[PDB]
């Protein structure tokens, strides 16, 4: 109806499909079941994958208005139509079953809208809930059985609510939380609300933990509440003018400050000057063992393979050069300030 209102447009679109009567509903469900059984028989006979045959039938039913390439679909269709009458019968039954499944799904969108209107305000918009319930409705149509003589709404409501609740658990938070943990958080909130209304005050973690049951203490309740903390927007306004936002007061502590880079460079320069007093080989040994050349620390055996010397002599010379550096530092005291 309204071009600018998506919800109204969707409701108008779904209002163009008349509701199914009991006889029509039973006929459609029976046709879907017969089509599925016919697909199974066709797969058993022709030897193809049942899923592949169902996809070919669905592509033919939906027509060319939908984007396995079309050539293999046409080849499989020709192969199925090459079968005798006793098997083209099952092909026709499959086609009618797919058409009936499409009609049955199209006629139960009012039910999913009615189910989804009760889940609003829990992190997902109305239309997202409607589409997730549509997925649940498709699953219900797939798993519905008309032999039990129950109406379609009774079994479809279960699946629609399931899909909507799963979607809320999976997509209503910026930092996704597993479904079991979402159920735990919801149960904890229910318990806290019940205790808050019964005690006439905000419960402490001890009461809440006691009411939750065994295996729950105040520490676990506090950790769960900390987990349940949604992230806050960086663009949330601060003051009354709304010109200032949260992100204007959060410093960046990842990139080093100019002071940090400057003192790192100063330490590097002073260490390079200090290593000059060492011997030509001892300085190299320390700069390799401490990762001052390649960036990563080497082992005694690796430095030996570089120099041809065994590990014991390497540790001895490194210790001697370290002692010499300590002596020079004691005699000069030009490197102690950088240690903080």
């Amino acid at each position: 109806i309204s071009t600018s209102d998506p919800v109204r447009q969707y409701l108008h679109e779904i209002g163009q499909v008349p509701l199914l009567t009991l006889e029509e509903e039973v006929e459609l469900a029976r046709k879907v079941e017969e089509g599925m059984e016919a697909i199974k028989k066709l797969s058993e006979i022709t030897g193809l994958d049942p899923d592949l045959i169902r996809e070919v039938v669905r592509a033919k039913i939906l027509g060319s208005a939908r984007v396995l390439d079309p050539k293999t679909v046409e080849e499989i269709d020709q192969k199925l139509k090459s079968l005798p009458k006793e098997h083209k019968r099952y092909l026709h039954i499959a086609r009618e079953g797919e058409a009936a499944r499409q009609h049955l799904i199209e006629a139960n969108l009012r039910l999913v809208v009615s189910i989804a209107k009760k889940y609003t305000g829990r992190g997902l918009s109305f239309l997202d809930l409607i589409q997730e319930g549509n997925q649940g409705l498709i699953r219900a149509v797939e798993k519905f059985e008309y032999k039990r003589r129950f109406k379609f709404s009774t079994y479809a409501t279960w699946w629609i609510r399931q899909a909507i609740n799963r979607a809320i658990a999976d997509q209503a938070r910026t930092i996704r939380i597993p479904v079991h943990m979402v159920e735990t958080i919801n149960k904890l909130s229910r318990t806290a609300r019940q205790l808050q209304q019964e005690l006439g005050r905000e419960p402490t973690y001890e009461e809440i933990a006691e009411a939750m049951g065994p295996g729950w203490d105040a520490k676990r309740v506090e950790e769960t509440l900390k987990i349940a903390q949604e992230p806050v927007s960086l663009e949330t306004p601060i003051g009354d003018e709304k010109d200032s936002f949260y992100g204007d007061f959060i410093p960046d502590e990842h990139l080093p400050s100019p002071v940090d880079a400057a003192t790192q460079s100063l330490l590097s320069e002073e260490l390079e000057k200090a290593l000059s007093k060492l011997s030509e080989r001892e300085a190299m040994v320390l700069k390799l063992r401490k990762g001052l050349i390649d960036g990563r620390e080497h082992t005694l055996e690796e430095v030996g393979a570089f120099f041809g010397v065994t590990r014991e002599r390497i540790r001895q010379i490194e210790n001697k050069a370290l002692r010499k550096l300590k002596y020079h530092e004691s005699r000069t005291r030009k490197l102690r300030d950088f240690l903080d």
Binding site: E13, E98, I105, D128, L234
Partner: protein, 350 residues
């Protein structure tokens, strides 16, 4: 951004562009010889949902008869507009009228107007006016105890229809195996059954009825009409900027000032696209860029709380809708659900 660049290139108004993009009206890319209300359908024509449905699937209507009363029309008879179907209802379109759910079957035995009652969970498995030998099934049911069989040889007559379906189609009887299947699309001269003895005489969607063992071709056209940004992208891909520029230059000599102004605006857009080296279809996104996460950070404050930007929420909504659309397409969801999800995807991108 007024004036719309896509609308300027494609010569679509802002209203038409909004209707096509947000799945309010269809736009035609290949009419396939479709006739609408006696007028051939042309390309770039806007079709509403009802017109598209009529052109693509045909005309049909179901009239629910009151309980108990019997229709004056038989199963498989042609009716005209305004003709009375039952004593209390009248049809609104000419076409073949079919019994939807016959509530009673009146078989005539030969030795005998024995009747049998049909319930919602029972379905008729035999056509009207069929000779049934002693033992053959007549009405199938979930429970075999209530299943109806034939005591002796007779003729099966169907009565008490729940409703009448009037469909504008063509019915072709057949005896051998049919060469076509339900849901296929046929043209005049195409084989249907009996090795070429029966051939289609009109366009439409073909369905085989084994109960009545006839082939019904519903009069409809395989029209190519699409909505959303895919149709607009197709139009922009089919655009020939050289030919458009030449036509705009030729129209620039029109005496009218408004015509020259419109031609100048369209030609300025065309010249911009031609000189820049950009392609018009690049105005429709196939891959959405994603900003580096440090420009949309999720930082932890000194208190341990998390602060994130709104771009993360917008990206999450876009990804959720795109993944759900992919799943729905993989499941063969109906056109209404797919259309709604595509519209949501467009709105999330916006």
């Amino acid at each position: 951004d007024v004036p719309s660049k896509i609308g300027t290139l494609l010569d679509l108004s802002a209203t038409e562009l909004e209707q096509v993009l947000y799945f309010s009206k269809y736009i035609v890319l290949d009419p396939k010889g479709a006739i609408l209300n006696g007028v051939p359908v042309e390309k770039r024509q806007l079709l509403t949902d009802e017109e598209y449905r009529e052109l693509r699937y045909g005309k049909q209507e179901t009239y629910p008869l009151p309980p108990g009363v019997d229709a004056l029309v038989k199963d498989g008879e042609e009716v005209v507009k305004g003709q009375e179907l039952a004593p209390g209802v009248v049809s609104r379109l000419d076409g073949v009228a079919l019994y939807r759910f016959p509530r009673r079957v009146r078989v005539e035995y030969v030795k005998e107007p024995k009747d049998y009652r049909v319930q919602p969970h029972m379905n008729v498995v035999v056509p009207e006016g069929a000779r049934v030998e002693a033992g053959d099934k007549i009405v199938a049911a979930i429970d075999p105890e209530e299943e109806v069989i034939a005591e002796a040889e007779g003729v099966v007559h169907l009565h008490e229809p729940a409703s009448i379906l009037v469909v504008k189609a063509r019915v072709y009887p057949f005896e051998d195996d049919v060469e076509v299947s339900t849901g296929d699309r046929v043209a005049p001269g195409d084989v249907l059954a009996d090795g070429g003895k029966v051939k289609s005489d009109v366009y439409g969607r073909v369905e085989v009825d084994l109960v009545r063992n006839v082939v019904r071709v519903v009069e409809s056209y395989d029209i190519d009409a699409r909505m959303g940004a895919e149709a607009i992208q197709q139009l922009l891909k089919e655009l020939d900027l050289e030919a458009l520029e030449k036509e705009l230059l030729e129209e620039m000599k029109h005496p009218s000032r408004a015509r020259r102004a419109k031609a100048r605006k369209r030609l300025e857009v065309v010249r911009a696209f031609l000189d820049s080296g950009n392609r018009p279809e690049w105005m429709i996104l196939e891959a959405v860029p994603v900003l580096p996460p440090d420009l949309r950070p999720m930082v932890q404050v000194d208190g341990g709380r998390f602060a994130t930007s709104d771009l993360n929420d917008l990206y999450r909504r876009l990804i959720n809708r795109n993944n759900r659309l992919k799943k729905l397409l993989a499941q063969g969801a109906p056109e209404i659900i797919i259309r709604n999800e595509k519209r949501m995807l467009q709105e999330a991108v916006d």
